[PDB]
Structure 1
Amino acid sequence: ATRAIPELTKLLNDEDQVVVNKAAVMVHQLSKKEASRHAIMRSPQMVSAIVRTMQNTNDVETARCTAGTLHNLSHHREGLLAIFKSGGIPALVKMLGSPVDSVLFYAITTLHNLLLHQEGAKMAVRLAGGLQKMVALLNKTNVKFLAITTDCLQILAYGNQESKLIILASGGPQALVNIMRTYTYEKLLWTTSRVLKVLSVCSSNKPAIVEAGGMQALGLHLTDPSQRLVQNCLWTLRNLSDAATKQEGMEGLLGTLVQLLGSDDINVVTCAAGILSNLTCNNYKNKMMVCQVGGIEALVRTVLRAGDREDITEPAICALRHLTSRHQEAEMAQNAVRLHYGLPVVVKLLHPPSHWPLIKATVGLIRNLALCPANHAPLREQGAIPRLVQLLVRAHQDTQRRVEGVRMEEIVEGCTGALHILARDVHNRIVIRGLNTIPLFVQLLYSPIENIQRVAAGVLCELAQDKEAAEAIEAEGATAPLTELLHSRNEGVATYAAAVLFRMSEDKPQDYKKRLSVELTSSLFRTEPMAWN
């Protein structure tokens, strides 16, 4: 067709429907020929003819043949280019709304090659309103067609904030989630999971996916033979997990996640640990269920297997911290960590080479574990107290002289809080007192952070129940600062201050105790206007 093209070009522009039809069929025929193919994708007059005819024609075959030709052109650079700098993209997008399937299929696949290989096609498709049309097409039922379409969505949305916003506005989340729990065609499930994965990192799309049943839908494929599918579902679940605190019907997913903690795939275990951590954060129902399916045992094993792999231990420890507090079975979980040999490894994580993030989380877990008396002796025998006191001393110095994702004040508060609890035990108290912590705790009474003052006064209160410790607390100069804390806006701080102050004066003359009481009463009884100062 070296020089037979120009004739057809004119034939396509004809005004007789039967005439264009014949030309259209021929041009299509030639597109199948890698010889005459170039002859077409090299004549801008011809390419434009195909484009225009496809758009402005009422003949089924003509539409199918021109669309098909462009599709054959999209296999080569010049083809893509020729289609691009010819207004093909806007043209093909309009065709996405065609009532005839073959045209629909030719348009979407051609657009697909354009998005993947033609520079600047993404923006063009976006501007032409392709996204809006592709999302609406998610109601079709041909799984091979849904695969290419959803894949087009993934290509457009990847790293493109605005595309994601458009997909959300078009109901993209609900349609993608419907696909995940409706079809079994592995390739469609995988391409869709990839779109959901890309959207899941967006604060705007996250709530919509969750509300649409995304968490549960993705849970259904965690035990699927397809590895790549299970993984994308995991990465996606992890991204959505901090926004799924209000979901119900989560039992199956949680059950599966626990089981997945026993996988030999670091990526699967790491995600299962992260998802479980987020899903149990402030959700008693999820904490309850995770515990019922042996969540504690599984988590302890994971922490044991991970060794110094902090990308695994940190999330696992965080889940353990959540499962050991604020729910009906928290006490059972606190005991379970011990019964499954978790204390030795948990305490071990306080020592190097752990980093502040893991140490912070570990300290929090230890503080919950200490709520259970049966853990006092075991934690003590693992060297918990000296280690916690050493981290506190260290974190405190760095504070009074000046890290890696965490404020040292957080460590000071965490360690002091853990010790406050551990000090309930007669033996831990003497060790804590024996490590010369009193002067440190007294210094913390001057902290500007209300929570630190609370745990500081609190541990001093525990220590003060023993006469000798109470005398030592007075000797270290705790009276002045505690007297000031009596006026604290935090009643917890104020009550602890009153307890230590009165502990220190238990042996003074009745005259002195009476005066002190006047001060405690004047200070702890809030009257008149609060903010009066």
Structure 2
Amino acid sequence: PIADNEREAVTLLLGYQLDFYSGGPLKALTTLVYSDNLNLQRSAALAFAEITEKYVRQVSREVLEPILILLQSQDPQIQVAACAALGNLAVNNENKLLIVEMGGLEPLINQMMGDNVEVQCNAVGCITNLATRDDNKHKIATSGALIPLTKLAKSKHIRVQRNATGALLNMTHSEENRKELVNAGAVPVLVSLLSSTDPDVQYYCTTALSNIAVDEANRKKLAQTEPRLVSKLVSLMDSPSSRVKCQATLALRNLASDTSYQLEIVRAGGLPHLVKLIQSDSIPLVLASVACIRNISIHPLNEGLIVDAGFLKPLVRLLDYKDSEEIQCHAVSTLRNLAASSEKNRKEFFESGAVEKCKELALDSPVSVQSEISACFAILALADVSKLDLLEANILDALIPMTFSQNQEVSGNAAAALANLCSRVNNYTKIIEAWDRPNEGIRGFLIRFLKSDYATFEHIALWTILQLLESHNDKVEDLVKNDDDIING
């Protein structure tokens, strides 16, 4: 009797009745609407608001047109109820599109510009919901709603503020719409609302400004008109709200795309905040902050200040984040940005443990991380004063097998590093040891790169052979007398 399993599996699903968007009920409300009698229309509006409040689905033209018609009313009750109904229906994705196609934006804008704060709230909110569909965003942005949205973002009523700033946020997702926002004058408002004591408003405005900072032109504009923006974001890095912390950090990263902001964030005291955030052991916070410091470390004038601030060891520790490839990449990239600085910073770099950790990661990490590490080694090897030390950390053990990689960032930078390590060093012991190992070591490298199609690789091989000859060493001169090496020409 397996059947009685099935017998109750069906009844169950026959369960999985409150639908009134058609037939009798709908016709009754519609009849109330087209009566053009004020009281009856009030009744219809209240009914619609309640119904949409309790249940929402994709509805047809005949549901939305009586509501749109109710939105032409001068009566506050009708207005607020109809706006509530349309706003509720605008939670469904097909409804958003249909509502905008029917010309709902014009009545909504009109209702926004009236002196009724509840109607303001509901109309703005309806627009907020409409703007969560990509198709609608540009149409809303160019419809004229931006001026009243910007104005209403300054409302003393927190619900109106949330809806307004939310809509503004919903139109920072494309370059064009962001341009529309900046042209409508939203930026001073957003910046001012960075100080808001409401978590939602603060988050919306922080995120909105962060998205606005994605565009170079907006960054330039902000640099000219909003001089205290960096300070405010910096102070927002210490917000008790985690998402506001994270987003403020992201905004600072985005801004740090530019040189001037790279200097300005440091000048405004952002470094200790970043130092703390990069050690939070919260993946979002760490990601944001390591990205930010990655951008900031590009400016030479910051290097010293970054090392004094104590970034090196936190950065090095980030390399143990084996389940976050991006964090590893950014950490290593920042380290490499700190790898060709002054002597003090160099000593600090070597005292951080970056070389050893990078060596450890070089042969057991994603190819992106490998690439960053390889580049880091390549730049580190440029300093003569460091070469021996790099050699005594046995990084040749990493470099040599990396010259086998089909990723040319890896292999190319490994070749560069190795080559430079072979040049003008006082002691060639480590090089002699690594002549045949690992994996044919340095001689094998020389062979393979001597027969390379890519003229740069071949140039590298020839150049490092020359550097090996150039140095006054008796034995490496003995080791180059092997026939696979020489007749290459």
Contact 1:210 1:244 in 2 (8 A): no
1:434-470 CA distances to partner (integer Å, 9 max, x unpaired)? 3443354244334343333442222123311226166
Cα distance in 2 between the residues matched to 1:149 and 1:388: 56
Q: What is the CA–CA distance in structure 1 between the aligned matches of 2:125 and 2:84, rounded to whole Å?
A: 8
Report what 1:355 is aligned to: 324
Matched, 1:71 2:45: yes
Residue 254 (structure 2) aligns with:
278
Alpha carbons of structure 1 residues 224 and 208: separation in structure 2 relative to 1, 3 Å? same
Partner residue of 1:480?
A: 447
What code does the residue aligned with 2:275 have?
V
Conserved in 1, the CA contact under 8 Å of 2:113 and 2:148?
Answer: no
- The amino acid of 1:257's aligned partner reads L
- The answer to whether 1:418 aligns with 2:390 is no
Deviation string 1:123-175 (CA, Å, 9 cap, x unpaired) is: 663453313542465555655433211101123333x3333353245255x43
Contact kept, 8 Å, 1:470 with 1:500, in 2: the verdict is no
Aligned to 2:347: 377
Q: Percent identity?
A: 15
Matches within 5 A, 1:491-506: 496-506=460-470
1:101-180 map, 5 Å: 101-102=74-75, 106-107=78-79, 109-116=81-88, 122=95, 125-135=99-109, 138-140=112-114, 143-158=117-132, 160-172=133-145, 174-175=146-147, 178-179=150-151
**Superposed CA offset, 1:16-54 (max 9, x none):** xxxxxxxxxxxxxxxxxxxxxxxxx98877644432233
Task: Confirm or deny: 8 A CA contact 1:393 1:440 kept in the other structure.
Answer: yes
Is residue 264 from structure 1 mapped to residue 228 from structure 2 by the alignment?
Answer: no
Q: 2:45–2:70: 8 Å Cα contact kept in structure 1?
A: no
Residues of 1 paired with 2:311 and 2:354: CA distance? 13
Tell me the TM-score normalized by structure 2: 0.76
Instruction: Tell me, yes or no, if the aligned pair for 1:385 and 1:428 is still in contact at 8 Å.
Output: no
Counterpart selection for 1:291 from 266, 283, 304: 266
Q: Which residue among 458, 461, 486 is the counterpart of 2:416? A: 458
The answer to whether the 8 A contact 1:470-1:504 is kept is no
In 2, Cα distance between equivalents of 1:337 and 1:360: 18
1:324–1:334: 8 Å Cα contact kept in structure 2? yes
TM-score, structure 1 as length reference: 0.70
Deviation at 1:412, TM superposition (A): 1.1
Asked if structure 1 preserves the Cα contact closer than 8 Å seen for 2:171 and 2:178, the reply is: yes
Offset from partner CA, 1:373-430 (integer Å, 9 cap, x none)? 32222222222111010101223xxxxxxxxxxxx22111111122223334556433
2:313 paired with 1:344: yes
Please show how residues 72-111 of structure 1 align to structure 2 within 5 Å: 72-77=46-51, 87=62, 89-94=64-69, 96=71, 98=72, 101-102=74-75, 106-107=78-79, 109-111=81-83
Query: Does structure 1 residue 390 correspond to structure 2 residue 390?
Result: no
Give 1:502-521 correspondences, 5 Å limit: 502-506=466-470
What is the CA–CA distance in structure 1 between the aligned matches of 2:116 and 2:262, rounded to whole Å?
Answer: 41
CA contact (8 A) 1:206 1:240 kept: yes
Q: Secondary structure at the match of 1:269?
A: helix
Q: Give the match for residue 9 of structure 1.
A: none
The alpha-carbon distance between structure 1 residues 473 and 503, as it changes in their structure 2 partners (threshold 3 A), is: farther
For the pair shown, which has the larger CA radius of gyration, 1 or 2?
Answer: 1
Single out whichever of 241-250 and 341-350 deviates more from structure 2.
241-250
Q: In terms of mean alpha carbon deviation, does 347-356 or 383-392 score higher?
A: 347-356
- From the superposition, tell whether residues 45 and 315 of structure 1 become closer, same or farther in structure 2 (CA, over 3 Å): closer
Matched pairs, number: 438
Greater Cα offset, 378-387 or 140-149: 140-149
**1:153 to 1:430, Cα distance in 2 relative to 1, 3 A:** same
In the alignment, the residues of structure 2 paired with residue 488 and residue 273 of structure 1 have an alpha-carbon distance, to the nearest angstrom, of: 42
Q: Tell whether the 8 Å contact from 1:261 to 1:269 is kept in structure 2 after alignment.
A: yes
Distance 1:118 1:132 in 2: 15
Aligned-pair distance for 1:257? Answer: 0.8
Alpha-carbon RMSD: 3.9
Secondary structure, counterpart of 1:389 in structure 2 = helix
Change (3 A) 1:75 1:474: closer
